[PDB]
Design a protein around this ligand. Structure first.
Ligand SMILES: [Co+2]
Ligand SMILES: [Co+2]
Ligand SMILES: [Co+2]
Ligand SMILES: [Co+2]
Ligand SMILES: [Co+2]
Ligand SMILES: [Co+2]
Lengths: 449, 449
C-alpha cells in the first residue's frame, strides 16, 4: 500500500549546460519528507550493506554507470539520509581506533557494542553479545543472511558467530587462532560451526570451501561440516536452478545456499589501476564478467528469493544483504570490479524497496561498514599511487586514484559516510549518528524485548 | 521556545567500550524531525561554506578536536542532512568534468547553472547569470559576503563578479587573462572592480593587496581601487577594533573589511605531512598560531558582526560565510592547519545557529564546495604520499594521508559530500541533490520573485 514515498527521480532534470538543467529536485520537499516520517512498528527490516561503500565509491559508480547527473534507482532513492561514524576501539586501551575493519563494524551494528578490529560478536573483553539476528529469531521472526562473500567472511559472520578473530573460518583455523573458541577445547566452535548452530531460516552466499573441513568434537565429530548441515535438516543448494526450486525455508527446513568455493564472481572485469595509469595508458571501458552466468544467482535474485521465503512468517523478518566485493575490488585497486559490485548492490536495493513500498511496514536501510581508498581526481592528475582513466556513460573520462598503500592492498579510510533509510522509524538515520545507534534503531523498530 | 530544534547533543552518550555507550541518540527521532520541517518563508538565509570540507575533513577535525565520539556544536548540530554532487562541465564539450574547482562550484550554488572550472558567474558560453546575492539586493534584502580568503578568491568572488577566469583579480590580471571583461575593453571589469560595483552591504575578508591597483579606465581611472572605494562612499575597516565599532552598514554606507593583504591568518600550525611521516616522525599536537592575532577578527566574530549589521533590515538578509582555508591547508597537506580552520568554521556555525534559533525564520545551510584529498588511515599505514600521526583529544593517535599528487598541491576529489540545514525549507537538502539545487532552494525559500 502506497503511503511512504520512495524517491522516483533524483537525476539531473534537463540539459546540464543550461540554467536549472542539472537540478535533481523539481519542487519543495517539505511535504514529501513529512510523508516519509512514521513511528509505527517495522514488521520487517532489510539492511543492505555495501562493504567499503563510502560516498566516494557511490559517486564513482554513479558517474561511470549512470552519468554524473544520473540516479541510482535503488541506492539514491531512500529519502531519509544522514552520516554515521564507524570507528572501532583499540583492544588494549579501549580508546577509539579511527579506522575499523569489517568485523568490528559489523559487530557494532549487529550487537550495539563497539569492539576491536577483527572481533566478531564479542566486545573488547571478548565477552559475547547477542546479535540482532539471534534476537529476531528468539522473538519468533524469520531471519536471512545474504552475501556475495564467503559466508564465513566478517560481514555475514558477525550475525551468527562469536569469535575472537575473524580468521576462525573452520576447525583448523580456530584451533590455531581462536583456541578459546575451538570446539575440542570446550568453546562454541568455528565461525562455520556457530553459523550452523545459529540456524537462520535463509543463508545464501559463497564459502563452500570450509564446509569440507570435519569437526574435531561433538555430535558430528569426524563428519564434514557439509555432512553436518545435511544431518541437521538443512536444505543445501549450490546454483540458481537449485535455489529457484526451493519453496519454503523455516526452522524445520532451513536454507543454506553455497554458490562458490570462496567469493562469488564479480559482475565486471577490467584491469588493475597502475602508477601514472591516467597519463600513460588509454581509458578503460568495463566489461561483463563471463563467469557470472545464469547458473549463479545474482545478489538481486538472492535478495528476492530471501524476501519471498522469509515473508511467509506472519510475525515478520530480519534480513541482511551484503554487496561484499565493492570493498574487495577497492583493495585490489580495480575500478571496474569495484563499480560493478556497486551497480550489483543497487539492483538488490531496488528489489528491497519495491517490496517495502508495497508491504508498507518494512524499514529498509542502505549503508556501508566503513569508507575506503578510492578517490575521483582530475584527469591530468600526477599521483604517487595507482590511477586509471575510465570512459563513463557520459562519454567523458573519469580518473580514479588509490593512493594510501605501497602494500599489496589499498586501505580502508575513517571518514563518516552515508546511511539512508525508508520506512517506519527511518528518521533515526538522519543527521549524525554512530554505527552502534543502528543496532538500537533496528531493535526498537522491531519492538524487540 | 524555538519550535524548530537544534541538535543539542549527539556525542557518544557514555562509555564507548560498553553496550550502547557509543550511541549518539537517546531515543526515537521521528517527532524531532517532524518538528524540524516547515515550509514557511525563510526571512533570512545564512550559507556557511567550508571550502574543501568533505565528510573526511569533518571527521578528521571531529576526531582530533572533539574525539571520535565527540560532537561539533555547530557543524554536527543541523538536523536535516543529505549528500550533494558538485561536478563541473568541460567548457568545450559541455559534458561533466568530475572534479570541480572553487569557481565552478560557487557559480553553481550562486547562479543555478553548472559551468567550467575557473569560471565565475558565467556559463560555458561565457554568458552572465545573476547571483543569489545580486538577486537578494535587488529585492530589498541586506547582503553579506564574508570569507577568511582574499575577497577576490573564487568563493566570495562568485557572488559579485562575472569573469571568464577566476585569475582576474584586478585590472592587470584582467587585461591579460580576461580581455573581454577588461574595463578598458568595454567589459564589466576585474573581479575587484565588479565587487565594488556589486556593492553588497557587508563585505569582510582579506585581499587588500589588489586594491592598491588603479583603474585603467572608467570614472575612477588613475585612482587606486581603494581610493575608488573611498571615493564611492565605502566605509573601510582594517582591524578588529575598527570593525567592532561600526554601528551600521547600508547602501550609502557599505562596509568593506580588509583584514589582511592576502588570506587571513589560520588558527593552528603544525608540520606539513611527509613521506612515511606517521612511521618516521613523532605524533603531532597542533599549536596555536601566535600571529593569528587579537586585532584580527575571527570568522565567528566577522559572522556575528555581519549578522548584527544585516539583521537591522526588516525585509531580511542573505549572508554567505566561508571558512576558506580548510581547503588551502588540505592542499598544503597540513592536518593541523586544516583541522584548525574546520574548528574555526564550527564556531561561526554556532553563531549562525544561535541567531537562527532565536529568530525563527532563518534557514542556515552548512556544506562544502567540493571534496578534497585528506584521508584518515590506520596508524601503521605505509603509503606512497604524505602522512602524519596526530595526538587527538581521545589520547590516541590518528593518521592522515594525502596521496593524490606528486605536485606541490594536493588535489580536490569528486565525491559527493554532506550538506546540512536548519530552519524553513531545510527539507530541500535531504537525500541526493545537486549543488545547483541549492541556488533554487535559497531563491525559493526567500521567495525572490
Ligand atoms: Co569492510
Ligand atoms: Co564484508
Ligand atoms: Co576491506
Ligand atoms: Co574549493
Ligand atoms: Co574558497
Ligand atoms: Co582547492
Amino acid at each position: 500500500t502506497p503511503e511512504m514515498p520512495v524517491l522516483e527521480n533524483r537525476a539531473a532534470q534537463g540539459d546540464i549546460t543550461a540554467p536549472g538543467g542539472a537540478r535533481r529536485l523539481t519542487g519543495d520537499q517539505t511535504a514529501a519528507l513529512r510523508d516519509s516520517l512514521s513511528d509505527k512498528p517495522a514488521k520487517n527490516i532489510i539492511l543492505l550493506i555495501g562493504d567499503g561503500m563510502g560516498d566516494s565509491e557511490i559517486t564513482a559508480a554513479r558517474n561511470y554507470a549512470e552519468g554524473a547527473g544520473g540516479f541510482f534507482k535503488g541506492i539514491d532513492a531512500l529519502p531519509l539520509t544522514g552520516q554515521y561514524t564507524h570507528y572501532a576501539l583499540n583492544k588494549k586501551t579501549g580508546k577509539p581506533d579511527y579506522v575499523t575493519d569489517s568485523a568490528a563494524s559489523a559487530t557494532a551494528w549487529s550487537t550495539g557494542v563497539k569492539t576491536y578490529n577483527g572481533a566478531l560478536g564479542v566486545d573488547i573483553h571478548e565477552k559475547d553479545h547477542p546479535t540482532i539476528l539471534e534476537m529476531a529469531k528468539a522473538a519468533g521472526l524469520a531471519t536471512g543472511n545474504v552475501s556475495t562473500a564467503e559466508l564465513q567472511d566478517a560481514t555475514p559472520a558477525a550475525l551468527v558467530a562469536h569469535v575472537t578473530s575473524r580468521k576462525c573460518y573452520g576447525p583448523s583455523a580456530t584451533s590455531e587462532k581462536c583456541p578459546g573458541n575451538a570446539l575440542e577445547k570446550g568453546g562454541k566452535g568455528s565461525i562455520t560451526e556457530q553459523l550452523l548452530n545459529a540456524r537462520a531460516d535463509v543463508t545464501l552466499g559463497g564459502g563452500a570451501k570450509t564446509f569440507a573441513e570435519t569437526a574435531t568434537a561433538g555430535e558430528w565429530q569426524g563428519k564434514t561440516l557439509r555432512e553436518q548441515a545435511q544431518a541437521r535438516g538443512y536444505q543445501l543448494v549450490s546454483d540458481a536452478a537449485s535455489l529457484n526450486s526451493v519453496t519454503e525455508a523455516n526452522q524445520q527446513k532451513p536454507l543454506l545456499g553455497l554458490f562458490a568455493d570462496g567469493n562469488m564472481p564479480v559482475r565486471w572485469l577490467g584491469p588493475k589501476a597502475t602508477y601514472h595509469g591516467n597519463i600513460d595508458k588509454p581509458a578503460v571501458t568495463c566489461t561483463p564478467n563471463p563467469q557470472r552466468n545464469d547458473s549463479v544467482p545474482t545478489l538481486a535474485q538472492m535478495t528476492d528469493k530471501a524476501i519471498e521465503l522469509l515473508s511467509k512468517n506472519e510475525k515478520g523478518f530480519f534480513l541482511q544483504v551484503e554487496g561484499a566485493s565493492i570493498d574487495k575490488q577497492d583493495h585490489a585497486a580495480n575500478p571496474c570490479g569495484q563499480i560493478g559490485e556497486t551497480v550489483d548492490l543497487d539492483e538488490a536495493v531496488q528489489r528491497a524497496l519495491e517490496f517495502a513500498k508495497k508491504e508498507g511496514n518494512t524499514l529498509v536501510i542502505v549503508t556501508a561498514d566503513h569508507a575506503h581508498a578510492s578517490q575521483i581526481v582530475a584527469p591530468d592528475t600526477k599521483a604517487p599511487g595507482l590511477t586509471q582513466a575510465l570512459n563513463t556513460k557520459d562519454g567523458a573520462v573519469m580518473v580514479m586514484s588509490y593512493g594510501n598503500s605501497e602494500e599489496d592492498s589499498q586501505e580502508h579510510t575513517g571518514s563518516q559516510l552515508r546511511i539512508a533509510a525508508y520506512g517506519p522509524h527511518a528518521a533515526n538515520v538522519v543527521g549524525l549518528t554512530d554505527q552502534t545507534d543502528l543496532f538500537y534503531t533496528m531493535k526498537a523498530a522491531l519492538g524487540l524485548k
